[PDB]
Design a protein around this motif. Structure first.
Motif, PDB file in Angstrom:
ATOM      1  N   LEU A  23     105.164  21.671  -0.419  1.00 37.96           N
ATOM      2  CA  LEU A  23     104.921  21.319   1.242  1.00 37.96           C
ATOM      3  C   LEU A  23     105.758  20.479   1.767  1.00 37.96           C
ATOM      4  N   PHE A  24     105.842  19.295   1.183  1.00 43.00           N
ATOM      5  CA  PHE A  24     106.857  18.255   1.511  1.00 43.00           C
ATOM      6  C   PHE A  24     108.228  18.612   1.803  1.00 43.00           C
ATOM      7  N   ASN A  25     108.686  19.308   0.760  1.00 43.90           N
ATOM      8  CA  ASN A  25     110.118  19.701   0.869  1.00 43.90           C
ATOM      9  C   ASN A  25     110.239  21.040   1.894  1.00 43.90           C
ATOM     10  N   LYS A  26     109.153  21.682   2.036  1.00 45.54           N
ATOM     11  CA  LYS A  26     109.353  22.645   2.741  1.00 45.54           C
ATOM     12  C   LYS A  26     109.726  22.219   4.472  1.00 45.54           C
ATOM     13  N   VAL A  27     109.414  21.035   4.887  1.00 48.51           N
ATOM     14  CA  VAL A  27     109.517  20.649   6.279  1.00 48.51           C
ATOM     15  C   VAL A  27     110.582  19.801   6.258  1.00 48.51           C
ATOM     16  N   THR A  28     111.529  20.139   7.197  1.00 51.12           N
ATOM     17  CA  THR A  28     112.740  19.363   7.427  1.00 51.12           C
ATOM     18  C   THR A  28     112.366  18.323   8.683  1.00 51.12           C
TER      19      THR A  28
END
Ligand SMILES: *[C@@H]1O[C@H](CO)[C@@H](O)[C@H](O)[C@H]1NC(C)=O
Lengths: 36, 47
Positions: free
Chosen positions: B34-39
């Motif tokens: 989830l943290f990586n999915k958000v730019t």
């Protein structure tokens, strides 16, 4: 003291941990405790 | 609360949601995804 929020001058830094009294930011809190 | 070292949950399995000690930030696999999915922009670091 240097913190993610910025430079905190006039407060002694300790490695203990307590409940937040005065929230500073980035997980740092300040409080009045002990000679005080 | 802290999960017991032995994960004997009667077959139910929660590794993908429990913390992973390997990561420097103790986040689970799904939390990392989830943290990586958000730019995110303008994190708010010292800079
Ligand atoms: C406070 O933080 C840790 C606690 O284990 C240790 O380095 C020492 O007791 C203290 N160090 C400083 C810089 O206060």
């Amino acid at each position: 003291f240097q913190t993610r929020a910025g430079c905190l001058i006039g407060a002694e830094h300790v490695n203990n941990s307590y409940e937040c009294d005065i929230p500073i930011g980035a997980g740092i809190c300040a409080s009045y405790q002990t000679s005080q | 609360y802290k999960t017991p070292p032995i994960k004997d949950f009667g077959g139910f399995n929660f590794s993908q949601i429990l913390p992973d000690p390997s990561k420097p930030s103790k986040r689970s696999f799904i939390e990392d995804l989830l943290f990586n999915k958000v730019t995110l922009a303008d994190a708010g670091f010292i800079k």
